[PDB]
């Protein structure tokens, strides 16, 4: 429901229109303080009209208009007002909603800025792994599956849009030893280790290994595998290469910083 | 029964035209005042009050602001209800929903009291 | 039984743990959704409630120990109180050194033992490479 | 996978001279030697006699042609139904050329089949849409040419033989 | 759209900018009631006394404060007080071999010039053959310096030429 942001923007716009009206009528209530060469400050008056032209910005709200026109009479809210009149203590529900949203955003910002850790070091479960894999499989166009043909370690494969499927061996976490193979795969009777490529997919595997060694966290493997899955899914397009042309080399793929760009650019 | 979007759509052109009219009458009052003060009397005609113009402008502005704020509040209420409760109303048993809301309120109050005792122990 | 340098190191580790526990309590508060959301009615709810209760009790004990070690460091100012070597930073022990040498020798022996063990482990991994 | 291919019919100097100039430009681009997968273009027809080869050849009768069997099976089917088909007598031409794999991109120069023809430049994609690098290379490779636009980007999964039949359709061009 | 107020403000030529007061402020103070929008006292003297009056232009001061401590600058006979503002009498007191102090008299801080002037060089350079080679190298380097600067560029080039032309 991003229309709330649009309505807040419209409120800010109309408040700015009122403020600009007040400001221009106040400026008209004063003359040239000290010009001594030309009363060019009257041009600021015209500039004030530009702020009044910002009223047309409120007309932009007509594009954001038609945000809500439905039934759903306030979404299951009325309990005491439209219900038991004696049930007056209702608003506690809305208070709790606001409290929870505030706590959520507060803790989110706190965790986001707490990246500057201060802990030096630490000095003085296959079912869980399969469950984490299945939970990560919950994203669209990211059909993954595992079989564990050899060993107690995890053998996971991912196929997003093309025949560029990737295999990643895990040890219940921090899945290292990545191998991407475009257009064949599981030869013999299980996953293979051919690692054949077109001198570019091998580079992609190198990038994946670099990320795995880079996105390795000291604990909490959930966030680790989540960042891993997002980093891999970011390859769904492979069609744009900023900071250079589209043919800087054999192929231009390296989104390590949440944005794809031309390869060989570190 | 008018809608917030409908009232906004019918108020915006009234607001614009009232702004135009008040600015025109303000310019007329200004040129009349200057002609009577700076130069000789030429605008031998009574002007307007000029106060009702911007007064009603600000009135319609306040009306628009508060109705848009009410609409925003309604959307926020719907969003928070959908987030804190599943969409089920006559489907869900109403007394069960009331009990679930009461338990949610009690749980939030307990979390708040725990954090408050934590802060007090920090003191 | 002075253990003063170890006490200062323990205080540093304790404030580091306080910071890490602050990070942890924030990371566990951010994922505290509505009670009757889907299924976490009271089980995981009360579970994390008790978890944060233990968190705050441990943090209070840690603050107690921090106050105690700070008071101990303050009262430790006995003899050579000024000690201006802070701004003047530069620009028997035999028995302890011998015990350290013997410990390092035993550590080198155990290191060779671990080297043999990991060689055998790599060999076993090689065998498994031959597996079907 | 099935990448575009066109034939810029140049003139002025010569056909062989234009071919040599294109080959020199490709070598300057860094075209590595990758053999000569000379792809013929024979006609007997609404079937066809496509002998283009990509280590396997086939003729596309219609519906882009199944032609999923090996070349020996297709030739045996042709010799068996000698006359039982409606496609022996038309002009049997054969185009040739060399194939160079610059870097994960093979380029083939289909020369004059019967002698009157152009030198079709055929490229091969890796995975395949996917015209960003394609166009970036085509503009840096030739001038106002290489339009391509085959029966691609419609989604039946990277069909090469349909493109080959489209290229062989240039017989009536001269 | 409301260009009427614009043409009216254009009309507002006469000096009596007080009719607009009676025209606008009644309703303004009526509907808006901040008679004291800034009751904080505002009384500060703009210019009482602010001047260095005791040194050269501090621009060269802030420049020379950055240079390496191996450069020791002193004060020559008083002929570069304010306008010239610079008598770069420097010694390269460091682990490298010493030499003759440079002159390097730059110009007012506008910098339509540089420092090197080399007055006392005539006898300081031609006497010693090695120092003559040093001077040749320093001149060749300065000529290749596009628009050298007051202290940093000149002294840096001089030091690098002195410790490169050793051979």
PDB file of N, CA and C in Angstrom, chain D residues 79-147:
ATOM      1  N   UNK D  79      18.055 -40.852 -50.908  1.00  0.00           N
ATOM      2  CA  UNK D  79      18.395 -41.781 -51.982  1.00  0.00           C
ATOM      3  C   UNK D  79      17.354 -42.885 -52.092  1.00  0.00           C
ATOM      4  N   UNK D  80      16.745 -43.275 -50.973  1.00  0.00           N
ATOM      5  CA  UNK D  80      15.693 -44.283 -51.009  1.00  0.00           C
ATOM      6  C   UNK D  80      14.481 -43.767 -51.774  1.00  0.00           C
ATOM      7  N   UNK D  81      13.980 -42.599 -51.387  1.00  0.00           N
ATOM      8  CA  UNK D  81      12.862 -41.974 -52.089  1.00  0.00           C
ATOM      9  C   UNK D  81      13.348 -41.170 -53.290  1.00  0.00           C
ATOM     10  N   UNK D  82      14.170 -41.801 -54.125  1.00  0.00           N
ATOM     11  CA  UNK D  82      14.653 -41.171 -55.347  1.00  0.00           C
ATOM     12  C   UNK D  82      13.488 -41.028 -56.316  1.00  0.00           C
ATOM     13  N   UNK D  83      13.011 -39.798 -56.503  1.00  0.00           N
ATOM     14  CA  UNK D  83      11.850 -39.530 -57.312  1.00  0.00           C
ATOM     15  C   UNK D  83      10.548 -39.568 -56.539  1.00  0.00           C
ATOM     16  N   UNK D  84      10.491 -40.346 -55.455  1.00  0.00           N
ATOM     17  CA  UNK D  84       9.303 -40.378 -54.611  1.00  0.00           C
ATOM     18  C   UNK D  84       9.052 -39.055 -53.894  1.00  0.00           C
ATOM     19  N   UNK D  85      10.045 -38.172 -53.836  1.00  0.00           N
ATOM     20  CA  UNK D  85       9.889 -36.808 -53.369  1.00  0.00           C
ATOM     21  C   UNK D  85       9.551 -35.911 -54.554  1.00  0.00           C
ATOM     22  N   UNK D  86       9.266 -34.644 -54.268  1.00  0.00           N
ATOM     23  CA  UNK D  86       9.113 -33.630 -55.297  1.00  0.00           C
ATOM     24  C   UNK D  86      10.278 -32.648 -55.307  1.00  0.00           C
ATOM     25  N   UNK D  87      11.413 -33.010 -54.697  1.00  0.00           N
ATOM     26  CA  UNK D  87      12.544 -32.098 -54.506  1.00  0.00           C
ATOM     27  C   UNK D  87      13.880 -32.876 -54.576  1.00  0.00           C
ATOM     28  N   UNK D  88      15.157 -33.173 -56.602  1.00  0.00           N
ATOM     29  CA  UNK D  88      16.272 -33.639 -57.565  1.00  0.00           C
ATOM     30  C   UNK D  88      16.823 -32.507 -58.420  1.00  0.00           C
ATOM     31  N   UNK D  89      15.958 -31.757 -59.127  1.00  0.00           N
ATOM     32  CA  UNK D  89      16.318 -31.060 -60.368  1.00  0.00           C
ATOM     33  C   UNK D  89      16.757 -29.613 -60.216  1.00  0.00           C
ATOM     34  N   UNK D  90      16.486 -28.961 -59.096  1.00  0.00           N
ATOM     35  CA  UNK D  90      16.861 -27.559 -59.064  1.00  0.00           C
ATOM     36  C   UNK D  90      18.370 -27.431 -58.952  1.00  0.00           C
ATOM     37  N   UNK D  91      18.840 -26.188 -58.986  1.00  0.00           N
ATOM     38  CA  UNK D  91      20.280 -25.930 -58.969  1.00  0.00           C
ATOM     39  C   UNK D  91      20.866 -26.358 -57.632  1.00  0.00           C
ATOM     40  N   UNK D  92      21.853 -27.252 -57.676  1.00  0.00           N
ATOM     41  CA  UNK D  92      22.536 -27.736 -56.469  1.00  0.00           C
ATOM     42  C   UNK D  92      23.806 -26.914 -56.264  1.00  0.00           C
ATOM     43  N   UNK D  93      23.715 -25.890 -55.424  1.00  0.00           N
ATOM     44  CA  UNK D  93      24.843 -25.013 -55.136  1.00  0.00           C
ATOM     45  C   UNK D  93      25.451 -25.408 -53.795  1.00  0.00           C
ATOM     46  N   UNK D  94      26.622 -24.849 -53.484  1.00  0.00           N
ATOM     47  CA  UNK D  94      27.311 -25.183 -52.236  1.00  0.00           C
ATOM     48  C   UNK D  94      28.135 -23.985 -51.791  1.00  0.00           C
ATOM     49  N   UNK D  95      27.755 -23.384 -50.667  1.00  0.00           N
ATOM     50  CA  UNK D  95      28.519 -22.284 -50.101  1.00  0.00           C
ATOM     51  C   UNK D  95      29.620 -22.814 -49.190  1.00  0.00           C
ATOM     52  N   UNK D  96      30.674 -22.014 -49.034  1.00  0.00           N
ATOM     53  CA  UNK D  96      31.818 -22.424 -48.230  1.00  0.00           C
ATOM     54  C   UNK D  96      32.302 -21.281 -47.350  1.00  0.00           C
ATOM     55  N   UNK D  97      33.476 -21.444 -46.747  1.00  0.00           N
ATOM     56  CA  UNK D  97      34.042 -20.410 -45.908  1.00  0.00           C
ATOM     57  C   UNK D  97      34.724 -20.957 -44.672  1.00  0.00           C
ATOM     58  N   UNK D  98      35.266 -20.067 -43.845  1.00  0.00           N
ATOM     59  CA  UNK D  98      35.962 -20.446 -42.627  1.00  0.00           C
ATOM     60  C   UNK D  98      35.183 -19.983 -41.403  1.00  0.00           C
ATOM     61  N   UNK D  99      35.391 -20.686 -40.292  1.00  0.00           N
ATOM     62  CA  UNK D  99      34.727 -20.395 -39.029  1.00  0.00           C
ATOM     63  C   UNK D  99      35.784 -20.085 -37.980  1.00  0.00           C
ATOM     64  N   UNK D 100      35.715 -18.887 -37.404  1.00  0.00           N
ATOM     65  CA  UNK D 100      36.678 -18.433 -36.410  1.00  0.00           C
ATOM     66  C   UNK D 100      35.967 -18.147 -35.098  1.00  0.00           C
ATOM     67  N   UNK D 101      36.498 -18.686 -34.008  1.00  0.00           N
ATOM     68  CA  UNK D 101      35.936 -18.501 -32.672  1.00  0.00           C
ATOM     69  C   UNK D 101      36.788 -17.468 -31.945  1.00  0.00           C
ATOM     70  N   UNK D 102      36.344 -16.212 -31.971  1.00  0.00           N
ATOM     71  CA  UNK D 102      37.086 -15.129 -31.339  1.00  0.00           C
ATOM     72  C   UNK D 102      37.204 -15.367 -29.839  1.00  0.00           C
ATOM     73  N   UNK D 103      36.077 -15.316 -29.126  1.00  0.00           N
ATOM     74  CA  UNK D 103      36.057 -15.669 -27.708  1.00  0.00           C
ATOM     75  C   UNK D 103      34.604 -15.983 -27.355  1.00  0.00           C
ATOM     76  N   UNK D 104      34.285 -17.272 -27.251  1.00  0.00           N
ATOM     77  CA  UNK D 104      32.919 -17.731 -26.998  1.00  0.00           C
ATOM     78  C   UNK D 104      31.938 -17.180 -28.027  1.00  0.00           C
ATOM     79  N   UNK D 105      32.431 -16.843 -29.217  1.00  0.00           N
ATOM     80  CA  UNK D 105      31.596 -16.327 -30.293  1.00  0.00           C
ATOM     81  C   UNK D 105      32.184 -16.777 -31.619  1.00  0.00           C
ATOM     82  N   UNK D 106      31.512 -17.718 -32.271  1.00  0.00           N
ATOM     83  CA  UNK D 106      31.957 -18.237 -33.553  1.00  0.00           C
ATOM     84  C   UNK D 106      31.348 -17.419 -34.683  1.00  0.00           C
ATOM     85  N   UNK D 107      32.180 -17.060 -35.655  1.00  0.00           N
ATOM     86  CA  UNK D 107      31.749 -16.323 -36.833  1.00  0.00           C
ATOM     87  C   UNK D 107      32.097 -17.141 -38.068  1.00  0.00           C
ATOM     88  N   UNK D 108      31.117 -17.316 -38.944  1.00  0.00           N
ATOM     89  CA  UNK D 108      31.256 -18.098 -40.162  1.00  0.00           C
ATOM     90  C   UNK D 108      30.894 -17.226 -41.354  1.00  0.00           C
ATOM     91  N   UNK D 109      31.664 -17.351 -42.429  1.00  0.00           N
ATOM     92  CA  UNK D 109      31.483 -16.539 -43.624  1.00  0.00           C
ATOM     93  C   UNK D 109      31.017 -17.450 -44.752  1.00  0.00           C
ATOM     94  N   UNK D 110      29.703 -17.516 -44.949  1.00  0.00           N
ATOM     95  CA  UNK D 110      29.142 -18.264 -46.053  1.00  0.00           C
ATOM     96  C   UNK D 110      29.417 -17.591 -47.381  1.00  0.00           C
ATOM     97  N   UNK D 111      30.278 -18.201 -48.187  1.00  0.00           N
ATOM     98  CA  UNK D 111      30.723 -17.605 -49.435  1.00  0.00           C
ATOM     99  C   UNK D 111      29.677 -17.827 -50.527  1.00  0.00           C
ATOM    100  N   UNK D 112      30.064 -17.562 -51.773  1.00  0.00           N
ATOM    101  CA  UNK D 112      29.165 -17.708 -52.914  1.00  0.00           C
ATOM    102  C   UNK D 112      28.913 -19.195 -53.139  1.00  0.00           C
ATOM    103  N   UNK D 113      27.642 -19.597 -53.102  1.00  0.00           N
ATOM    104  CA  UNK D 113      27.304 -21.008 -53.253  1.00  0.00           C
ATOM    105  C   UNK D 113      27.516 -21.475 -54.689  1.00  0.00           C
ATOM    106  N   UNK D 114      26.770 -20.900 -55.629  1.00  0.00           N
ATOM    107  CA  UNK D 114      26.953 -21.202 -57.041  1.00  0.00           C
ATOM    108  C   UNK D 114      27.909 -20.237 -57.726  1.00  0.00           C
ATOM    109  N   UNK D 115      28.377 -19.217 -57.015  1.00  0.00           N
ATOM    110  CA  UNK D 115      29.263 -18.219 -57.563  1.00  0.00           C
ATOM    111  C   UNK D 115      28.663 -16.827 -57.525  1.00  0.00           C
ATOM    112  N   UNK D 116      27.400 -16.683 -57.943  1.00  0.00           N
ATOM    113  CA  UNK D 116      26.642 -15.472 -57.600  1.00  0.00           C
ATOM    114  C   UNK D 116      25.998 -15.607 -56.230  1.00  0.00           C
ATOM    115  N   UNK D 117      26.560 -14.910 -55.245  1.00  0.00           N
ATOM    116  CA  UNK D 117      26.034 -14.872 -53.883  1.00  0.00           C
ATOM    117  C   UNK D 117      26.919 -13.935 -53.072  1.00  0.00           C
ATOM    118  N   UNK D 118      26.477 -13.644 -51.855  1.00  0.00           N
ATOM    119  CA  UNK D 118      27.211 -12.797 -50.935  1.00  0.00           C
ATOM    120  C   UNK D 118      27.928 -13.660 -49.900  1.00  0.00           C
ATOM    121  N   UNK D 119      28.568 -13.010 -48.934  1.00  0.00           N
ATOM    122  CA  UNK D 119      29.274 -13.685 -47.849  1.00  0.00           C
ATOM    123  C   UNK D 119      28.498 -13.424 -46.564  1.00  0.00           C
ATOM    124  N   UNK D 120      27.612 -14.353 -46.213  1.00  0.00           N
ATOM    125  CA  UNK D 120      26.795 -14.191 -45.024  1.00  0.00           C
ATOM    126  C   UNK D 120      27.617 -14.380 -43.764  1.00  0.00           C
ATOM    127  N   UNK D 121      27.545 -13.404 -42.866  1.00  0.00           N
ATOM    128  CA  UNK D 121      28.242 -13.454 -41.588  1.00  0.00           C
ATOM    129  C   UNK D 121      27.293 -14.048 -40.559  1.00  0.00           C
ATOM    130  N   UNK D 122      27.647 -15.213 -40.028  1.00  0.00           N
ATOM    131  CA  UNK D 122      26.822 -15.922 -39.060  1.00  0.00           C
ATOM    132  C   UNK D 122      27.550 -15.975 -37.727  1.00  0.00           C
ATOM    133  N   UNK D 123      26.855 -15.595 -36.656  1.00  0.00           N
ATOM    134  CA  UNK D 123      27.421 -15.607 -35.317  1.00  0.00           C
ATOM    135  C   UNK D 123      26.622 -16.601 -34.480  1.00  0.00           C
ATOM    136  N   UNK D 124      27.199 -16.999 -33.347  1.00  0.00           N
ATOM    137  CA  UNK D 124      26.601 -17.990 -32.460  1.00  0.00           C
ATOM    138  C   UNK D 124      26.607 -17.460 -31.032  1.00  0.00           C
ATOM    139  N   UNK D 125      25.426 -17.401 -30.421  1.00  0.00           N
ATOM    140  CA  UNK D 125      25.272 -16.931 -29.049  1.00  0.00           C
ATOM    141  C   UNK D 125      25.570 -18.067 -28.082  1.00  0.00           C
ATOM    142  N   UNK D 126      25.672 -17.741 -26.795  1.00  0.00           N
ATOM    143  CA  UNK D 126      25.964 -18.738 -25.768  1.00  0.00           C
ATOM    144  C   UNK D 126      24.690 -19.318 -25.160  1.00  0.00           C
ATOM    145  N   UNK D 127      23.814 -18.459 -24.643  1.00  0.00           N
ATOM    146  CA  UNK D 127      22.600 -18.912 -23.973  1.00  0.00           C
ATOM    147  C   UNK D 127      21.319 -18.397 -24.608  1.00  0.00           C
ATOM    148  N   UNK D 128      21.270 -17.126 -24.989  1.00  0.00           N
ATOM    149  CA  UNK D 128      20.069 -16.555 -25.568  1.00  0.00           C
ATOM    150  C   UNK D 128      18.905 -16.498 -24.599  1.00  0.00           C
ATOM    151  N   UNK D 129      15.754 -12.810 -27.800  1.00  0.00           N
ATOM    152  CA  UNK D 129      16.323 -11.777 -26.942  1.00  0.00           C
ATOM    153  C   UNK D 129      17.845 -11.787 -27.009  1.00  0.00           C
ATOM    154  N   UNK D 130      18.475 -11.194 -25.994  1.00  0.00           N
ATOM    155  CA  UNK D 130      19.932 -11.153 -25.868  1.00  0.00           C
ATOM    156  C   UNK D 130      20.575 -10.501 -27.093  1.00  0.00           C
ATOM    157  N   UNK D 131      20.222  -9.236 -27.311  1.00  0.00           N
ATOM    158  CA  UNK D 131      20.732  -8.469 -28.439  1.00  0.00           C
ATOM    159  C   UNK D 131      21.644  -7.328 -28.012  1.00  0.00           C
ATOM    160  N   UNK D 132      21.841  -7.133 -26.707  1.00  0.00           N
ATOM    161  CA  UNK D 132      22.712  -6.060 -26.238  1.00  0.00           C
ATOM    162  C   UNK D 132      24.138  -6.263 -26.732  1.00  0.00           C
ATOM    163  N   UNK D 133      24.779  -7.348 -26.293  1.00  0.00           N
ATOM    164  CA  UNK D 133      26.119  -7.650 -26.778  1.00  0.00           C
ATOM    165  C   UNK D 133      26.107  -7.974 -28.265  1.00  0.00           C
ATOM    166  N   UNK D 134      25.028  -8.589 -28.755  1.00  0.00           N
ATOM    167  CA  UNK D 134      24.914  -8.856 -30.185  1.00  0.00           C
ATOM    168  C   UNK D 134      25.041  -7.570 -30.991  1.00  0.00           C
ATOM    169  N   UNK D 135      24.249  -6.554 -30.641  1.00  0.00           N
ATOM    170  CA  UNK D 135      24.296  -5.298 -31.381  1.00  0.00           C
ATOM    171  C   UNK D 135      25.603  -4.559 -31.133  1.00  0.00           C
ATOM    172  N   UNK D 136      26.112  -4.609 -29.899  1.00  0.00           N
ATOM    173  CA  UNK D 136      27.376  -3.945 -29.595  1.00  0.00           C
ATOM    174  C   UNK D 136      28.512  -4.519 -30.429  1.00  0.00           C
ATOM    175  N   UNK D 137      28.446  -5.814 -30.742  1.00  0.00           N
ATOM    176  CA  UNK D 137      29.476  -6.424 -31.572  1.00  0.00           C
ATOM    177  C   UNK D 137      29.209  -6.201 -33.055  1.00  0.00           C
ATOM    178  N   UNK D 138      27.940  -6.230 -33.466  1.00  0.00           N
ATOM    179  CA  UNK D 138      27.621  -6.044 -34.876  1.00  0.00           C
ATOM    180  C   UNK D 138      27.954  -4.636 -35.347  1.00  0.00           C
ATOM    181  N   UNK D 139      27.678  -3.624 -34.523  1.00  0.00           N
ATOM    182  CA  UNK D 139      28.007  -2.258 -34.915  1.00  0.00           C
ATOM    183  C   UNK D 139      29.512  -2.036 -34.957  1.00  0.00           C
ATOM    184  N   UNK D 140      30.254  -2.657 -34.043  1.00  0.00           N
ATOM    185  CA  UNK D 140      31.706  -2.581 -34.048  1.00  0.00           C
ATOM    186  C   UNK D 140      32.340  -3.491 -35.088  1.00  0.00           C
ATOM    187  N   UNK D 141      31.553  -4.350 -35.733  1.00  0.00           N
ATOM    188  CA  UNK D 141      32.082  -5.295 -36.706  1.00  0.00           C
ATOM    189  C   UNK D 141      31.847  -4.861 -38.146  1.00  0.00           C
ATOM    190  N   UNK D 142      30.668  -4.332 -38.457  1.00  0.00           N
ATOM    191  CA  UNK D 142      30.354  -3.876 -39.805  1.00  0.00           C
ATOM    192  C   UNK D 142      29.641  -2.533 -39.703  1.00  0.00           C
ATOM    193  N   UNK D 143      29.198  -2.021 -40.847  1.00  0.00           N
ATOM    194  CA  UNK D 143      28.541  -0.729 -40.889  1.00  0.00           C
ATOM    195  C   UNK D 143      27.031  -0.821 -40.909  1.00  0.00           C
ATOM    196  N   UNK D 144      26.407  -0.194 -41.906  1.00  0.00           N
ATOM    197  CA  UNK D 144      24.951  -0.195 -42.034  1.00  0.00           C
ATOM    198  C   UNK D 144      24.523  -1.523 -42.650  1.00  0.00           C
ATOM    199  N   UNK D 145      24.523  -2.557 -41.816  1.00  0.00           N
ATOM    200  CA  UNK D 145      24.152  -3.900 -42.242  1.00  0.00           C
ATOM    201  C   UNK D 145      23.807  -4.715 -41.001  1.00  0.00           C
ATOM    202  N   UNK D 146      23.665  -6.030 -41.186  1.00  0.00           N
ATOM    203  CA  UNK D 146      23.368  -6.987 -40.126  1.00  0.00           C
ATOM    204  C   UNK D 146      22.055  -6.646 -39.433  1.00  0.00           C
ATOM    205  N   UNK D 147      20.957  -6.500 -40.180  1.00  0.00           N
ATOM    206  CA  UNK D 147      19.667  -6.275 -39.510  1.00  0.00           C
ATOM    207  C   UNK D 147      19.174  -7.500 -38.766  1.00  0.00           C
TER     208      UNK D 147
END
